[PDB]
Each structure stands twice: as structure tokens, then as C-alpha cells.
Ligand binder design. Structure first.
Ligand SMILES: [Zn+2]
Lengths: 50, 50, 188, 447
DNA sequence: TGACACGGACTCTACGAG
DNA sequence: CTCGTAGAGTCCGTGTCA
């Protein structure tokens, strides 16, 4: 919601969802690119964490 | 809503495109206003009272 | 209003989760920042969840109640009362099968105890700390044994086929899918 | 490394090629799809993709395959078998069209799996009563693995579960018979598939190591450049990942023959990716990149002017320093504000957060709902006070107690008198209601 | 914190079998 | 009677309230 004064207030789930979706898209592109094993491992680790 | 449109047609009530927001006195307090201050940002047209 | 009773709770099946959700959220954008209308098809998206303002689509093609069940062709937003924006759930199609933390770390580790495999091992597996030999064919290797990097390396070189080992939530899903519940119940 | 790792990749797949060649009847289908390839309806890279230790060159090499193969094929039944293994290693150079190896490796894998399913039901039978160590299972089962003889060899060792297996004698022989069918399609036994599979894995591992090196060599560089971008709302690890993507992109696109310093090219792409990612996915509300550059300029200018002047530069002074009309200056200042976390605790009262205050303006006021209800009731009865078809006219012209409103021509069609007379009716009704004492009660609804 | 409790893992003692 | 296994107790670390 836009609180009076041009600033915004959001629940944290917005940030969490944004981060998860980012890592998901990055992993998709990484698979399309056939990155070396180490990088796919790191990506899956971070996605699990998120 | 429709019925109110009917009412506007009937009485010819030009709807005012500006809502009221005035800072009215809080409920149940009564006293004397001793002073007023006005702060305009630089650039805007100072009103007479300023 | 229905008069109900008996609240039922169960694991959500993937087909049930797809059943509830009305759309997939592909991009992370939230709102247009110029006019704060929602971005499509972002975390806030009208063509998935619902119209911001009552009974008018996003693009502004249909604004009258005369249009109330029609779905604007330009903006894929259906015209309804904004309250629906409170009830529709969405979904994200996840690329890598991911483990549900609650069923893992809750003191009785139901992934752990279901697998009859210690907890420390499972944490090691999910975070890509070690492999696990998932049904290691005709070799000298167990089915729920965790393997370190160099153990898996000497093994792969040693055992090319009839050798299935994996890492992470994918391996865990593999291990879970193949388990025969009732036969093991009889044995136990 | 790209050419090196590609060579090792081809060497691994070449190893699987050798493994297949050392397997039987593979050479028959092999020569058949070489014959297919001769018509030239495909590419030279579906049959040879880099060697190990032109149509004519392939023709002559395959002529040598045919010759060595057949001459060892006649005397195949001792050393000629080792010569066939050598033919497998020399063909290792060639790789077959993806479909054919997919077909063979998948049929061989699923057959090994199927025999494994039979073996595992046997292993259930053994583990439940006799707990068979796997060594004896292999040794007795491996070596023949083709006829049901091993079954009676299990019967021959006098083991209690092994003899008891007659309960599953039907299924065991069904597995052996289908296994014989797989034998016929290959025309051999199995154990050599074990040899084949180990060589395939060895080759693939070689290729694996090469690909690993294709970043092990340029890894820490990404980390070194990454530590720059370390405060733009981005988990360090995401930064390093974006840098890895950029580095891979550079490597695959790197051109040593175009005349360009390699390292610069790499770092260039690294930045091109990292800055792009921070610009796009850093802020919650994505904002054009040129706008970000505008913010950066503003911030440099503010820093210089502030530290020299001491006080600060007023937006007018900033509008001076840059040629922009300053309307966009304050626009950019408004845009840069990040959303505040809705849970931020309010002062010394960690009981309420900010979320606890925001009010929902959407809600229609109950007062207004009551007014609207009273209004519909009153308008309905007052319409009832007026004539019938005029009342219906007025209801239809508006949405009173009805759905979408039809324009005058359509309502006139509804009465079949379709023309200005309908607005004559509208104006006459309005005129008739103008008279007071009926509408004043509705006059009250104005304010 | 801090008093409690639980779980998992580890150490020490005791019993059955050879 | 000792070795190998079984049982009991303890300790540490985590979860849980204000
Ligand atoms: Zn629209």
C-alpha cells in the first residue's frame, strides 16, 4: 500500500518471494546454458536456502 | 450508482470534483488559537497570508 | 453461506496445488513505478489474481457493470469485485524439487525417521555436502549409504553402471518414491 | 579450455563409442548407419567428432573397420577377440548419430534394470531367510547369466532359499528367456557389458574433469571482481553467480583471432552481467537503467558539492550543476525511496509494528450503505407513485433495479415507438416530478 | 537468561553365549 | 569368564516460555 509521503510499506514475503523467483529464473537459464556442475550445485544450494 | 445518477439528472447537481480534507478541530477541545506558522517550499507562489 | 464442520488437513499433492492456483508468476516485477498499476505477470498481477479497482479491467476497455463476467481480450483480467484479490492463490513452477523444511528439522524428523537414516546424513545430502548411493546395483554398496566426494569419484571410475548416486533434494525424492511402505511394515 | 574441454567431451562420448563397439552386433548396425551416412543426407559430425590417438577419409577408415572386423570375425572363436577390442578403440574416434546411441544405451540400461528387478526379488527372497552375501550371487549368476543354469546352480549348491526358489521358478525362467531375446539382439552374453559400462564411465569421468577445469582455471577472478558490488541489496553469492554466468558467456564468445586482450574481454562481460543484474533485480520496483545512472550522477554531484561547500547543495544548486530541468531531479529523488519493512517496531513499545496502523480505505462506510438502501426504497415507491409505462421508461433509461442501461433508441424499440418521443417522455416525467412535496423527501439525500 | 524437557549420542556396566 | 551386545544414565545442544 502507498502510505502518504511517497514511501511504500510491504510485508517481508514480498522480498522472500522475489528472491526465490530470482533464483528460480537464474537456475532455469543456467540449465539452458549447461553450466558446469559446480555452478548448478551452488544454485540449487541457494534455492534450497531461500 | 444509477439511482444517484437519476437524482443528479433530476435536480441538476453538478458534482464537485474535489473532496474535502480540511484540518478541523479535534473533538471535544475548545480554546484560543494563539499563533499560526506557514511553511512554503521554495518556488511555489506564496499566498497573501504567508 | 454453507454450514460446515470437521476441518480436514493433509499433505498437498502437486496436482492439488496446481488445482488451486490460477496462474504462474514468471517474473519478479511488482508494479509499474510510473503509474503504480501492477506488472504482468509479476508478484502483483491483475490477469492472474484480479482487478485492482471494482468492476473495471486493467487496460480500461470495460468499466461498466454491463461487463461483469467478460474477460478483457487486451489485458487478460476478468472484471469482478476487488475482494477476489483476497482469495485467489498463485503458484510457481519450481525447477528443482525442494525439500519442505518442516518435515525435516522438526524434532521427530519425519523424512529422517521415514527413511530410517540418521538426520545428520540427510542435512549433509540436501545441502550438497555428500552424495548418497541410491540403489547401487550389483556392487558392494548399500542403498542408503552417504558417500563423500572422493568416495563417489573412485566409485564412478570403479562402478560405471548399476551405480546410482545423487545429491540433494533430488536424491531424497528418488529414495522416497521407491520405498515400499507395507512390505517394510510386514518385515518390521 | 573450451576447445580442450570439448575435446575431452568428445573423448568421453568416444569412450562410450568404444564401449558399444566392443559390444557385439553393434558393428553390424554401425556399418548400416555408415551406409546410411554415405548418401550424405547428414553431416560428418554425426559420425566423427574429433579423433583419439571429408567423405573419402571416413570411407577409407570404415573400409579398414570392415576389413579388420571381418578377418578377426572368421577366427574370432582368442586373440581375434582382443583385435575386436582394438577395433572398438580405433572406432572410439567416431561418434554415431545421437539417436542410435540413445537407443542402444537406453535398451541396455533398461534391460540391465529389468534383470536387476528379477535379481532384487531374488535378493529379497535370500535376505529374508538366508541373507545372501552379494559376492556369491555375482559369481554364480555372473559368467553365464544367460541360461537358467545358474538357477539350478543355485539349486546345485543345496542352499535352502536357493532350492526354495522354485516358488519363483516361473518368473525366473521368464526373465532368463527375455534375457535370451536380448542376447539374440546383441548375440552375446552380459559380463562384457560390465566391462563396457566401466569403460564408458571412465571416459565420461575424463570429460567431467576437463569441464571442471573450464572454471577451476578462471574461478577466483569472478570472486575478485565481485567484491566491488557489495552493497546493492544482493546476497554476495548471487553476485558471484551472475559473474560466473558472465564469465562463461565471455569464454564461449571469446575471440583470440579478433585481436583483443583476453582478460579485458572476460572482465568486460563480467561487469556487463553483474551491473545489469543489480540494476534490474536489486530494487523491488524495477526501474530503467538510465534512471539508475541518473541517481549515480546525482550522488556524485551531491558528494562533491557537499564536501566542498560544507553545508549542502540545494535542489536549485543541483539543477544548476546539471542541465536537467530539476523537475526530473525531484522526480528521481522521489523514485529512489525504498519501501520500509511493514514490521518496523515503533518506539519503546515492541508490541505493535507499522502494519498494525495502516487502515483500509477501500471499505465503503456503513453509513453510506444505509443511505443507499433508504434511497433505493424511496425511489422505488416514488416511481410507483407515477404512471406505469413512464415509470418503466425511467427505470430502463437508467439502471434502476435493472442491469445494463439501454440507450434511448433501444428502449423506444422496446415500446416500438423509437424516436425523439422517448426523450419527450423522459423530459415530461422529469418535469412532472419537479413539482415539490414529492421529491423534497428525496431532496434530503443531497448534501 | 533460566528453569525444563526432550532427543540424540556417547560411555560404562552387565548378561548371554561359546 | 570374557567378548560382544545390551541397557542405563548422562551430557550437550536445541526448542520453549516471559
Ligand atoms: Zn482491459
Amino acid at each position: 500500500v502507498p502510505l502518504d509521503g511517497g514511501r511504500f510499506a510491504t510485508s517481508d514475503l514480498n522480498d522472500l518471494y522475489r528472491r526465490v523467483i530470482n533464483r528460480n529464473n537464474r537456475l532455469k537459464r543456467l540449465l539452458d546454458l549447461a553450466a558446469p556442475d559446480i555452478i548448478v550445485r551452488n544454485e540449487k544450494r541457494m534455492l534450497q536456502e531461500a | 450508482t444509477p439511482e444517484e445518477k437519476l437524482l443528479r439528472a433530476i435536480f441538476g447537481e453538478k458534482a464537485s470534483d474535489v473532496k474535502d480534507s480540511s484540518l478541523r478541530v479535534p473533538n471535544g477541545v475548545s480554546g484560543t488559537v494563539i499563533d499560526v506558522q506557514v511553511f512554503t517550499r521554495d518556488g511555489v507562489e506564496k499566498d497573501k497570508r504567508a | 453461506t454453507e454450514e460446515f464442520d470437521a476441518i480436514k488437513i493433509a499433505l498437498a499433492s502437486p496436482d492439488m496445488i496446481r488445482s488451486w492456483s490460477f496462474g504462474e508468476v514468471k517474473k519478479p516485477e511488482t508494479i509499474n513505478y510510473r503509474t503504480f498499476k501492477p506488472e504482468r505477470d509479476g508478484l502483483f498481477c491483475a490477469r492472474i489474481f484480479g482487478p485492482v479497482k471494482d468492476y473495471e479491467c486493467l487496460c480500461g476497455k470495460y468499466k461498466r457493470l454491463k461487463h461483469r463476467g467478460v474477460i478483457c481480450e487486451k489485458c487478460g483480467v476478468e472484471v469482478t469485485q476487488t475482494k477476489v484479490r483476497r482469495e485467489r492463490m498463485g503458484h510457481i513452477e519450481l525447477a528443482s524439487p525442494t525439500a519442505h523444511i518442516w518435515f525435516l528439522k522438526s524434532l521427530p524428523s519425519r523424512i529422517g525417521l521415514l527413511l530410517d537414516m540418521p538426520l545428520r546424513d540427510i542435512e549433509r545430502v540436501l545441502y550438497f555436502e555428500s552424495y548418497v548411493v541410491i540403489e547401487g546395483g550389483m556392487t558392494n554398496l548399500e542403498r542408503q549409504q552417504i558417500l563423500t566426494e572422493e568416495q563417489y569419484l573412485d566409485a564412478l571410475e570403479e562402478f560405471g553402471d548399476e551405480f546410482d548416486a545423487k545429491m540433494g533434494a533430488e536424491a531424497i525424492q528418488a529414495l522416497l518414491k521407491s520405498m515400499d511402505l507395507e512390505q517394510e511394515c510386514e518385515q518390521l | 579450455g573450451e576447445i580442450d574441454i570439448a575435446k575431452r567431451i568428445e573423448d568421453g562420448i568416444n569412450q562410450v563409442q568404444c564401449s558399444v563397439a566392443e559390444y557385439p552386433e553393434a558393428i553390424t548396425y554401425l556399418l548400416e548407419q555408415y551406409d546410411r551416412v554415405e548418401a550424405e543426407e547428414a553431416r560428418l559430425s554425426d559420425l566423427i567428432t574429433g579423433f583419439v590417438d571429408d567423405p573419402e577419409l571416413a570411407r577409407e577408415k570404415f573400409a579398414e573397420l570392415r576389413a579388420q572386423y571381418v578377418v578377426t570375425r572368421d577366427t574370432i572363436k582368442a586373440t581375434a577377440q582382443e583385435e575386436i577390442l582394438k577395433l572398438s578403440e580405433v572406432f572410439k574416434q567416431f561418434r554415431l548419430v545421437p539417436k542410435q546411441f540413445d537407443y542402444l544405451v537406453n535398451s541396455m540400461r533398461v534391460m540391465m534394470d529389468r534383470v536387476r528387478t528379477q535379481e532384487r526379488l531374488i535378493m529379497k527372497l535370500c535376505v529374508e531367510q538366508c541373507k545372501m552375501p552379494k559376492k556369491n550371487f555375482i559369481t554364480l549368476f555372473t559368467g553365464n547369466e544367460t541360461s537358467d543354469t545358474w538357477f539350478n546352480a543355485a539349486i546345485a549348491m543345496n542352499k535352502p532359499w536357493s532350492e526354495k526358489l522354485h516358488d519363483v521358478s516361473e518368473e525366473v525362467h521368464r526373465a532368463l528367456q527375455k534375457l535370451q531375446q536380448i542376447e539374440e539382439e546383441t548375440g552375446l552374453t552380459i559380463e562384457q557389458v560390465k566391462d563396457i559400462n566401466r569403460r564408458m564411465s571412465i571416459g565420461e569421468a575424463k570429460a567431467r574433469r576437463a569441464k571442471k577445469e573450464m572454471v577451476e582455471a578462471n574461478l577466483r577472478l569472478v570472486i575478485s571482481i565481485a567484491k566491488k558490488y557489495t552493497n546493492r541489496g544482493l546476497q554476495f553469492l548471487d553476485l558471484i553467480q551472475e559473474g560466473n554466468i558472465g564469465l562463461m558467456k565471455a569464454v564461449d564468445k571469446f575471440e583470440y583471432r579478433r585481436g583483443y586482450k583476453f582478460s579485458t574481454y572476460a572482465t568486460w562481460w563480467i561487469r556487463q552481467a553483474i551491473t545489469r543484474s543489480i540494476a534490474d533485480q536489486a530494487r523491488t520496483i524495477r526501474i530503467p537503467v538510465h534512471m539508475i545512472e541518473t541517481i549515480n550522477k546525482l550522488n556524485r554531484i551531491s558528494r562533491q558539492m557537499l564536501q566542498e561547500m560544507g553545508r549542502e547543495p540545494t535542489p536549485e544548486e543541483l539543477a544548476e550543476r546539471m542541465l536537467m530541468p530539476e523537475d526530473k531531479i525531484r522526480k528521481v529523488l522521489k523514485i529512489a525511496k525504498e519501501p520500509i519493512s511493514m514490521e518496523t517496531p515503533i518506539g519503546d513499545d515492541e508490541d505493535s509494528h507499522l502494519g498494525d496502523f495502516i487502515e483500509d480505505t477501500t471499505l465503503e462506510l456503513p453509513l453510506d450503505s444505509a443511505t443507499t438502501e433508504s434511497l433505493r426504497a424511496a425511489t422505488h415507491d416514488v416511481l410507483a407513485g407515477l404512471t406505469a409505462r413512464e415509470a418503466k421508461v425511467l427505470r430502463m433509461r437508467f439502471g434502476i433495479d435493472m442491469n445494463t442501461d439501454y440507450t434511448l433508441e433501444e428502449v423506444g424499440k422496446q415500446f416500438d415507438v423509437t424516436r425523439e418521443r422517448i426523450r419527450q417522455i423522459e423530459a415530461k416525467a422529469l418535469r412532472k416530478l419537479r413539482h415539490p412535496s414529492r421529491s423534497e423527501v428525496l431532496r434530503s439525500f443531497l448534501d
